Amino acid sequence: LRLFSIGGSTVVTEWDLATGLPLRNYDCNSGVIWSISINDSQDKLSVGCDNGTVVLIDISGGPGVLEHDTILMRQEARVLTLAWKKDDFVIGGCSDGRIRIWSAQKNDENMGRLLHTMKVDKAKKESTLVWSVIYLPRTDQIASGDSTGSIKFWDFQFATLNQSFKAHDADVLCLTTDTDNNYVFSAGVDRKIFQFSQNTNKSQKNNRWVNSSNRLLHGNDIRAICAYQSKGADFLVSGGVEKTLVINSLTSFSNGNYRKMPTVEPYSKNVLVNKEQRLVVSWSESTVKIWTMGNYKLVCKLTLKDDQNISTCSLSPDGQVLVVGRPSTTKVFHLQPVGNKLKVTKLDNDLLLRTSTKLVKFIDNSKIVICSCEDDVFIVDLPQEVELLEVTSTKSSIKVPYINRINHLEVDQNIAVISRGCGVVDILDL
Amino acid sequence: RKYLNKLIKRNSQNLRSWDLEEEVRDE
Amino acid sequence: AYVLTETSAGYALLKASDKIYKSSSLIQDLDSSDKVLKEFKIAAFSKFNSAANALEEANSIIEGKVSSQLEKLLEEIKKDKKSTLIVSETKLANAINKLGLNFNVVSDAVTLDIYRAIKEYLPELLPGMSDNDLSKMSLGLAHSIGRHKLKF
Amino acid sequence: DKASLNDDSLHDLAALLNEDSGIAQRVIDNARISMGQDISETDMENVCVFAQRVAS
Amino acid sequence: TQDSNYVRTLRQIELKKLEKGAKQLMFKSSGNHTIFVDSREKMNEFTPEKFFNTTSEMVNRSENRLTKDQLANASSIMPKESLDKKKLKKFKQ
Amino acid sequence: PNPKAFPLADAALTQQILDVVQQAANLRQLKKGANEATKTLNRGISEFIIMAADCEPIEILLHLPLLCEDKNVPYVFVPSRVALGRACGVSRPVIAASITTNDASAIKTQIYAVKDKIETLLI
Amino acid sequence: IKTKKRKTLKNLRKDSVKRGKFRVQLLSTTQDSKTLPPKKESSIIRSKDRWLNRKALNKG
Amino acid sequence: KVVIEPHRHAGVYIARGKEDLLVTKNMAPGESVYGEKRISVKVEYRVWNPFRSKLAAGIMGGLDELFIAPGKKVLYLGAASGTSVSHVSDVVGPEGVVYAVEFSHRPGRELISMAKKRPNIIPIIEDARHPQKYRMLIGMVDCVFADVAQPDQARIIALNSHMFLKDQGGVVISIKANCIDSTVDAETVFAREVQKLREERIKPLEQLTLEPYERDHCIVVGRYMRSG
Amino acid sequence: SLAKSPASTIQILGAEKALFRALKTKHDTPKYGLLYHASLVGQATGKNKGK
């Protein structure tokens, strides 16, 4: 499986899940890109771009390769949201406040021709704009949440609405559906999650949705909903702006128990403390802030100007040494205390300057051990390598690549221990 | 060396006299 | 190993003493020279007949599929039941896999270095394969295929 | 036509103007390498009729 | 109708002659010319004379900057008053 | 309809085009028929060129995209000569028409908006 | 003091020196352009966030 | 009466006479292709129209490393109806050849007629994005010029230069901002295209805005290094 | 080029001398052109020859 992400720039960056690095930045041709959605069978992904257009880029023949296939017929409205019906139609909602339906059909005379447009009825003192579109397969419909704050249900043939709801106050931002499309959930900016249902026999026979219920859980607003349903479990996950994500049950959304996964999770840590000289060190993006204590007083602050990454692993042993390491490059520091102030300096070793460090540890104040993301461990004395015992790839190691990578490396005075997320652990004597 | 420099200068002067202008440039 | 190539001097199969490691060593050692040509000279040339119409239908149905002179060469390409072949097109690879010999062939892999190097050093194969300047025949082929692709 | 010209036709041009000058060899090479646009048979027939008229 | 035909004929006369005049004229480009380097020491070390291997006015002139080895108007009559006069005459026409 | 009629405007673009063709007709800024359209192209006065994608045979207006291309004038195909003739406001089918240049009209902003949309569609 | 040191910091950070009619720019590092995706466009992102924190919905 | 002057490159001349002009020395004399004028001084010379060809516009805009020398092989992508490819055949002369490419049919017929006129032009009328159908014909070009309008410009250039370019080779692109993006500023679009070529192994050397000739068109000159 | 020209030019095509003289002199333009010798214009009579 592959992971395509997209930021504010004009490329689609396809990640490499083995080492957690960008496998390839495919530059899409036309303009700043606003949205992305793959089709069924995961063969062709559509990107909707601020010039007003929609590009189809297709994946075929292994990862790491994306060739530009088609630019559909274009307009002058920037495309905010895309969806795929099938291998047949590309549905887009665009900032004119209107929804267009393009034909994406291999071997047809209509392909790349926008052949339906519908319009969301405007607001008054604003420029309305459609935020979220979704295709419902069973009931052959397209639903959309729009900046009037509303939810509309069009049907695909005749491209015409059956239902409209003034659901909530300010603009809708997300939509999700079921497997069989009995429930469609909408997520506003007014913190509410609305549930529209169709489950009864009469409502299914007459296509009538009902505004079944609503629930607010969040603090600021909502920005993403994804639902998953299978014989194991049935939950939708909604995450927003207040740095958290809540989890609800799908079929019992009015009755079920919600759970609020917090802001912070301490797996990839950001704070260490050395009892020698009694000092805490925290690190965030280009900031190494050090306090000493005994009350607490700040000493250090280290913007690393050259790098622009998150310093993912920094470590200081018992003493005056410090190291900082990113998946691109690293740096090593020596501190000299002059009192309440310290003076840092940057040393030089081309080995650490070229290598990437997933997991750094110290042996003593001279030698450190490095686990590099390609499963490669090194020792330096401030190119001494040591081998590993190989793991055999099963189907999970084929699909999810990073399982065989080393998760943790814990060091004693001399001896060390390796742990890889397949469930395997090893003891290393250096 | 200086002879070559002078020759280059002479050729440059010829080219300048071919393609030059005063206020004719702005005109 | 064998490699098939198509030029306006005919259809040439070149031998390669074994691939991918050879590709890497080729491009890193800059084997764009007659030294690499004499390391890997030739397996079997096939000059065509002097029939411009036959060449026309030939390279047209080469752009489409596999041709009959290609059949008359693929009857004797093989040394074993399976011999690795380097082809310059994926559809042609599927064609030569699905025709009547059924041996092993890699598609258009990383071997653009091989194809480009032999395209460059084919002037040094003018004393080897075609003792003539084939550019005039290439020009005639191009003008004739132009007059055929256009209606005319 | 510039194509149906063999070595017997080369000796036929030698029976015509001159082969010791090599013009027959020059025109047979240019005919074998020619890029001139081929014409229809009725065009060639009418060109032959016109050339016959001029020769007479 | 006859008046408008006459004016239209005169307009097409002048349009075709303006096309031919601008076709036989020649202008000087005024465009942005960037040069990509790889090291900032060389970027600070840049000099157009040192780059194109030319001199002053050859650097400032666009359509021809011949190198010093390429280098290493008496033919035209009165080059200080006449040539520019005829060029400006054609431009004014 | 006819696959040689390449840029074929949709419902919204065709509605905008036929509205501006109606406004241009009532301003008398519109030259109708393929011969008058070709004349406007040769004089060099067309803002843009509308054609009808269902004229049989199609070549009698296929001669126009060549001059439109070589003189950098936008052209588009709306899909019905009957509707185009009724937009231009004459009792016949009209297969081609041209909106002509005059920078003092009261429909200039509409003409430039539609012309920009056509330029985007050809680009 | 602080303003001029920030200005010479930006002067050292910049890359495009103008030399008369020409312009001299350099190319970045392939390691950065390979292991990092390009930065977002601040004006477009600012447009989306302005419309979300629009002054017509009485947020806060 | 007319005076010739060499250019910074070979095969490009400048007439200083009654009017200053940019000319090219004819390989074929006395026959005009698109009705351009000419000058005899005695051998023949042919005017190059910088408005009507995007290459001579970059010439008059000033360009240090133009890779077209006489005895070389040049591949022209986007040779529509034949004007500038006739000019580059004229400047390469008999030793160098030019592989012209085009897809369409009326410019195709005009290009075929002109290639019947000239010997160094060898014409292809195939899809420029599918390089195999002239891979069977073309061998190891020295430099590529390209002036296309499909927005996958870096894509087709990467393909054709991986298949045909000599190492340490030259590649010249014309880029049309109003066709590739048409909303953002042309400088930003050209910088994005420069990044695309730098990704696809074209080490760029310079770019140039064809200001008085075309709207928002640029030329990018780069080299091809250590690739395939 | 003949297809690119409009229809009125194809009518006028022959009588260009009288055409341009009448245009620059503000007289009436000729009406036949080179089409006079076609059979239909050979069957018409006068104003019908013009039409």
mmCIF file of C-alpha atoms in Angstrom, chain F:
data_model
loop_
_atom_site.group_PDB
_atom_site.id
_atom_site.type_symbol
_atom_site.label_atom_id
_atom_site.label_comp_id
_atom_site.label_asym_id
_atom_site.label_seq_id
_atom_site.Cartn_x
_atom_site.Cartn_y
_atom_site.Cartn_z
ATOM 1 C CA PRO F 1 -21.803 15.594 -32.317
ATOM 2 C CA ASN F 2 -19.349 15.715 -35.198
ATOM 3 C CA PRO F 3 -15.914 14.653 -33.862
ATOM 4 C CA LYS F 4 -14.138 17.106 -36.171
ATOM 5 C CA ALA F 5 -15.820 19.936 -34.223
ATOM 6 C CA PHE F 6 -13.311 20.015 -31.435
ATOM 7 C CA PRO F 7 -13.996 22.730 -28.789
ATOM 8 C CA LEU F 8 -17.644 21.990 -28.055
ATOM 9 C CA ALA F 9 -19.159 24.286 -25.464
ATOM 10 C CA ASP F 10 -21.320 22.883 -22.669
ATOM 11 C CA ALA F 11 -24.631 24.087 -21.206
ATOM 12 C CA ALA F 12 -23.321 26.909 -19.015
ATOM 13 C CA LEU F 13 -20.760 28.229 -21.480
ATOM 14 C CA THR F 14 -23.226 27.961 -24.354
ATOM 15 C CA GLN F 15 -25.797 29.854 -22.304
ATOM 16 C CA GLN F 16 -23.297 32.650 -21.660
ATOM 17 C CA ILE F 17 -22.304 32.704 -25.336
ATOM 18 C CA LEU F 18 -25.852 32.867 -26.626
ATOM 19 C CA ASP F 19 -26.712 35.624 -24.163
ATOM 20 C CA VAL F 20 -23.770 37.725 -25.332
ATOM 21 C CA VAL F 21 -24.670 36.945 -28.952
ATOM 22 C CA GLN F 22 -28.173 38.246 -28.258
ATOM 23 C CA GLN F 23 -26.834 41.442 -26.680
ATOM 24 C CA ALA F 24 -24.424 41.904 -29.588
ATOM 25 C CA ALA F 25 -27.230 41.449 -32.108
ATOM 26 C CA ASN F 26 -29.349 44.101 -30.448
ATOM 27 C CA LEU F 27 -26.312 46.401 -30.434
ATOM 28 C CA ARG F 28 -25.699 45.496 -34.138
ATOM 29 C CA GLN F 29 -22.106 44.453 -33.413
ATOM 30 C CA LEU F 30 -22.519 40.988 -34.907
ATOM 31 C CA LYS F 31 -21.712 39.707 -38.388
ATOM 32 C CA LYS F 32 -23.619 36.590 -39.387
ATOM 33 C CA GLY F 33 -22.971 33.764 -41.819
ATOM 34 C CA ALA F 34 -19.709 32.055 -42.643
ATOM 35 C CA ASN F 35 -18.725 34.340 -45.523
ATOM 36 C CA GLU F 36 -19.184 37.516 -43.488
ATOM 37 C CA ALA F 37 -17.307 35.852 -40.630
ATOM 38 C CA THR F 38 -14.418 35.067 -42.976
ATOM 39 C CA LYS F 39 -14.509 38.658 -44.199
ATOM 40 C CA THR F 40 -14.260 39.931 -40.617
ATOM 41 C CA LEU F 41 -11.269 37.680 -40.076
ATOM 42 C CA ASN F 42 -9.533 38.985 -43.187
ATOM 43 C CA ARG F 43 -10.129 42.620 -42.215
ATOM 44 C CA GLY F 44 -9.001 41.920 -38.666
ATOM 45 C CA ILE F 45 -11.937 43.145 -36.582
ATOM 46 C CA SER F 46 -13.392 40.099 -34.821
ATOM 47 C CA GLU F 47 -13.488 39.881 -31.062
ATOM 48 C CA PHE F 48 -14.413 36.220 -31.384
ATOM 49 C CA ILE F 49 -15.993 33.564 -33.591
ATOM 50 C CA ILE F 50 -18.921 31.253 -32.814
ATOM 51 C CA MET F 51 -19.673 28.210 -34.965
ATOM 52 C CA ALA F 52 -22.364 25.538 -34.959
ATOM 53 C CA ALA F 53 -21.181 21.982 -34.461
ATOM 54 C CA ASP F 54 -23.955 20.278 -36.444
ATOM 55 C CA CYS F 55 -23.694 21.823 -39.895
ATOM 56 C CA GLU F 56 -23.803 19.133 -42.581
ATOM 57 C CA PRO F 57 -21.279 18.993 -44.178
ATOM 58 C CA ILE F 58 -18.977 20.359 -41.481
ATOM 59 C CA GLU F 59 -16.109 21.492 -43.721
ATOM 60 C CA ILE F 60 -17.891 24.612 -44.969
ATOM 61 C CA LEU F 61 -17.146 26.116 -41.579
ATOM 62 C CA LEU F 62 -14.067 24.010 -40.879
ATOM 63 C CA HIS F 63 -12.249 26.484 -43.110
ATOM 64 C CA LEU F 64 -12.525 29.128 -40.317
ATOM 65 C CA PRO F 65 -10.414 27.653 -37.447
ATOM 66 C CA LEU F 66 -7.287 27.949 -39.593
ATOM 67 C CA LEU F 67 -7.557 31.716 -39.972
ATOM 68 C CA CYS F 68 -8.705 32.045 -36.346
ATOM 69 C CA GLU F 69 -5.582 30.181 -35.222
ATOM 70 C CA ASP F 70 -3.200 32.071 -37.492
ATOM 71 C CA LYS F 71 -4.602 35.451 -36.403
ATOM 72 C CA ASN F 72 -4.970 34.621 -32.664
ATOM 73 C CA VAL F 73 -8.744 35.038 -32.432
ATOM 74 C CA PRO F 74 -10.823 32.781 -30.162
ATOM 75 C CA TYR F 75 -13.336 30.401 -31.684
ATOM 76 C CA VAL F 76 -15.835 28.023 -30.117
ATOM 77 C CA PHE F 77 -18.486 25.523 -31.230
ATOM 78 C CA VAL F 78 -21.987 25.817 -29.814
ATOM 79 C CA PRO F 79 -24.028 22.696 -30.680
ATOM 80 C CA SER F 80 -27.024 23.894 -32.745
ATOM 81 C CA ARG F 81 -27.349 26.097 -35.800
ATOM 82 C CA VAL F 82 -31.071 26.615 -35.187
ATOM 83 C CA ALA F 83 -30.523 27.941 -31.669
ATOM 84 C CA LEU F 84 -27.574 29.997 -32.891
ATOM 85 C CA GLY F 85 -29.696 31.559 -35.619
ATOM 86 C CA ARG F 86 -32.406 32.404 -33.136
ATOM 87 C CA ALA F 87 -29.844 33.968 -30.813
ATOM 88 C CA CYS F 88 -28.539 36.108 -33.697
ATOM 89 C CA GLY F 89 -32.175 36.984 -34.299
ATOM 90 C CA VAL F 90 -32.844 36.031 -37.916
ATOM 91 C CA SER F 91 -35.402 33.651 -39.331
ATOM 92 C CA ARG F 92 -32.847 31.174 -40.718
ATOM 93 C CA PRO F 93 -30.343 28.687 -39.388
ATOM 94 C CA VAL F 94 -27.000 30.448 -38.980
ATOM 95 C CA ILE F 95 -23.940 28.223 -38.731
ATOM 96 C CA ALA F 96 -21.332 30.854 -37.897
ATOM 97 C CA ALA F 97 -21.194 34.364 -36.509
ATOM 98 C CA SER F 98 -18.670 36.871 -35.263
ATOM 99 C CA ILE F 99 -18.655 39.481 -32.514
ATOM 100 C CA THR F 100 -16.764 42.472 -33.903
ATOM 101 C CA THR F 101 -14.432 44.954 -32.247
ATOM 102 C CA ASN F 102 -15.634 48.307 -30.918
ATOM 103 C CA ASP F 103 -14.230 49.418 -27.566
ATOM 104 C CA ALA F 104 -17.048 51.884 -26.848
ATOM 105 C CA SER F 105 -19.927 49.441 -26.466
ATOM 106 C CA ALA F 106 -22.088 48.852 -23.414
ATOM 107 C CA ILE F 107 -21.493 45.089 -23.615
ATOM 108 C CA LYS F 108 -17.700 45.167 -23.569
ATOM 109 C CA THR F 109 -17.344 43.587 -20.132
ATOM 110 C CA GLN F 110 -19.621 40.686 -21.087
ATOM 111 C CA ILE F 111 -17.741 40.182 -24.353
ATOM 112 C CA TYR F 112 -14.416 40.129 -22.543
ATOM 113 C CA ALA F 113 -15.641 37.683 -19.886
ATOM 114 C CA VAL F 114 -16.945 35.254 -22.517
ATOM 115 C CA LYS F 115 -13.815 35.748 -24.630
ATOM 116 C CA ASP F 116 -11.647 34.904 -21.635
ATOM 117 C CA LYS F 117 -13.683 31.757 -20.969
ATOM 118 C CA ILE F 118 -13.232 30.704 -24.603
ATOM 119 C CA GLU F 119 -9.495 31.394 -24.401
ATOM 120 C CA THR F 120 -9.294 29.159 -21.333
ATOM 121 C CA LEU F 121 -11.250 26.429 -23.129
ATOM 122 C CA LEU F 122 -8.931 26.481 -26.145
ATOM 123 C CA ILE F 123 -5.815 26.636 -23.951
#
